[PDB]
Amino acid sequence: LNLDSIIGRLLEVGKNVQLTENEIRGLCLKSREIFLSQPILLELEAPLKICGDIHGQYYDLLRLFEYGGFPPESNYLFLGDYVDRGKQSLETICLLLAYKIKYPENFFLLRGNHECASINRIYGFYDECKRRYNIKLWKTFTDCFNCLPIAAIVDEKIFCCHGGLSPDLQSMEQIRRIMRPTDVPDQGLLCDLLWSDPDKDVQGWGENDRGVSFTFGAEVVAKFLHKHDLDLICRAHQVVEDGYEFFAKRQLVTLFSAPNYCGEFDNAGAMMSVDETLMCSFQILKP
Template sequence: MPSMETENSNVLRAEEIKLLANEAFKAHKYSQAIDLYTQAIELHSENAVYWANRAIAHTRLEEYGSAIQDASRAIEVDPKYSKGYYRRGAAHLAMGKFKEALKDFQQVKKICPNDLDATKKLKECEKAVMKLKFEEAIAVPESEKVEPQYDGARIEGDFVTLNFVKKMMDDFRNQKFLHKRYAFQIVLQTREMLCALPSLVDINIPDGKHFTVCGDVHGQYYDLLNIFELNGLPSEDNPYLFNGDFVDRGSFSLEVILTLFAFKCMSPIYLSRGNHESKSMNKIYGFEGEVRSKLSDTFVEAFAEVFCCLPLAHVINEKVFIVHGGLFSVDGVKLSDIRAIDRFCEPPEEGLMCELLWSDPQPQPGRGPSKRGVGLSFGGDVTKRFLQENKLDLVVRSHEVKDEGYEIEHDGKLITVFSAPNYCDQMGNKGAFIRFEAPNLKPNIVTFSAVPHPDVKPMAYANNFLRMFS
């Protein structure tokens, strides 16, 4: 058994060799560095730094398996040593093992919440994992053949056409389903189009042309059809923006989202993310259960991935700001700050993205806690400052049921629009949409009542526990 003196001598000698190894590493002599770190480890194997340093030298030589082994040993020696997780995560990332890398960078973030590089790597991994899940989800149905007896809408070739959409909408009206192959084609194409957009989308309406903004639809497919009856189908000359909360609560959410996505494939509509375009909401309020029931489990991840690609806000002609929820807990937020949001994730519980999706106006000035427990309430003075600082005229948002389908607040500077009449078959409210005509963009609000739908109750696919309290 080595004496205390020998142990101390080994520790000191190991540290000297580590410094030589570091110099070799800095000189890009990675093999030499590995040899020297190995000598240091042989003298003092319970130092996590030596293992982690040898791991990064292996990574430089693209010896990722050895790097993972060394980084794992560093973590065994010191479970709170962030560089062990970081080095292992980097090796996993280099090997394309995104799920494993994600776990490592999550651990780095937990130990060092202010590590900017780890935060960046974590976001890269989250995106890669979502993409991976999406690709896994769409891989199986690609090989599915459309059965000869299938008499529903068909996409001929690579492009969604108006004839296809009309046939699909009519099939949905008659409670027929779309073949999975075509549903995947729509979802995949929509994802590709949405991913190419910024987090804040600028819309230009030429003089003499009009533009329609709709609020929450919440799976009320037959009321969506009624909007199109009243205001015309989406087209290049009749463009729409649907301002989030397309799904959940109403039991025809799949029909709603596939219809909106199909029109998106043809380009005459814009889509904003709402707070219900998220996994946590979909799991509770029905969309996840409905997708599983009408399509398959594989579609659940596919829709979740596409929802993470939805833009967060729109601006019409540099005058009208449109967002699902509302404004912010701090003054001074510029449109450029919204454009800079990395939105490709599940909504966080705080920050600009959360507030865009969850906040509500309040009648009194200033800011207050949110009645929802997420986001905040903001007064007319907050709205006024935001508009002045960004040289805008009006905020349009949705997110709240209103008796008349809309409400004008904050001295006319903020309009709430809600497009799900008789919400959940029990609120008795009207629905509304807003038509803007360029150049003056004066809001023309159209209200409408609910129309009959098949006898499927709202929340039919919702979490069983939640239905007990509905």
Template sequence: MHLDKMLEWIKKCKYLPENDLKQLCDYVCDILVCEPNVIPVPSPVSICGDIHGQFYDLLELFRVGGELPDTTYVFLGDFVDRGYYSLETFTFLLVLKARFPDKIVLLRGNHESRQITQVYGFYDECMTKYGSNNAWKYCTRVFDLLTVAALIDNKVLCVHGGLSPDINSLDQIRALKRDQEIPHKGALCDIVWSDPEEVATWEISPRGAGYLFGKSVTEEFMEINNLDLICRAHQVVQEGHKYMFNEKLVTVWSAPNYCYRCGNIASILKIDGPKKPRSTLKL
């Protein structure tokens, strides 16, 4: 595979021929299958939230945050659906993963799912652009293998959604069977679906999957696992990032003017070192 040629092609917002996409997905699957459920990442690192098919905004993220391989990235999931260019967005990230596997971590979001993508646009986009659902099938195989958490300097836990009442320790996340469609309940579901909220402990989520989790359970989880920060995405926030629970948890959102109508800012969270202050870059 000519990854550099693919990169130049996709940067023009062009999708790959179907056979090239299949090769790329197979290649990336071979990389992902070797990654643990909680992937260790040393700082400095840039953390990005939901992208949702906003391809040109993704290019701007790299322009502002730094190009690979000079910058290490953790993406918190939700690469597809809702935006116009889910296929190009996801393919671009896959080529970067193939080209610089140790410099970019792709976490699974709740939209990296067969069921969700058939409702919110990615399936239809693949059908429109390729004339069959083969491309969607290649990509959903990659979805199943995406890892679910990153741990920066052993102190900052990155997930897409949040915590689970079934999970007390990072070792329990490490032991999950992730190679599957996201289930309707259980720990894997909760990690990609849950939201922080001003509740006492746990409450049923209005999303219909995952939970709402409060400050006390967040602090308990962080104490057990010796964490300084939980970094997640999953919810649009107008200023691009939002701290909660005495700054123990942060939501990062990286799709500006989400759905081309929300008017929100996007941000990247930069962690420069274990003892250095965190900073955010705005888009």
């Protein structure tokens, strides 16, 4: 009944929700256990709703649940980037962790490049934690982030991750052998899964403007799907005007779930529903 009270307070509502340090610490400790007990490559089954980046936009997260259904009315896969930039990362991550604890088999969260301590320091989560609580709580979130799964396959056909593909990715077993907990390295497989972007104008692998990881073209996607017998790559990590955006003739979709991203864009947010026959549709949240 501790958990339902945390949930009730989170849903009660820029107006903050300040839970207690012990509650938040319990959310990190318990969710971290569940993450580590579940595989690092999730095997999920439709029907499911899939969401892109939130970046602390807590009112938009509650909006996504209004559109999609509060759990356990729908099953969820989130693709990362819960924290940083927005004004309410603490409420966002804590509702996500509360749902994962209460619904461990029907609510799933992947690791984004922002679920990384070094990126947090720079992009606001460290500061939000230090201000509202203390640096040690931030360390507790960090240790929890280091245990998140990295990718998911829905019904053997949809490959999901925050960023994209890697040139070092030859078999799915490489992903399964990634040890947790771990920080995200500056280069290599785990990095690439969290950081890579598709690019229309590149062929093969390219230099990525971010100064981290790579870009990959349409041909890389077609080869990856064919090789691994998949129909779709579902990823996030880039703001797209319509909330979702296809690439490589519908073989890759980018999802982004934070409308009016960071005050600075006029984008819709989208959420992708996958039904039991693997049909994909989109609910759109305009800014």
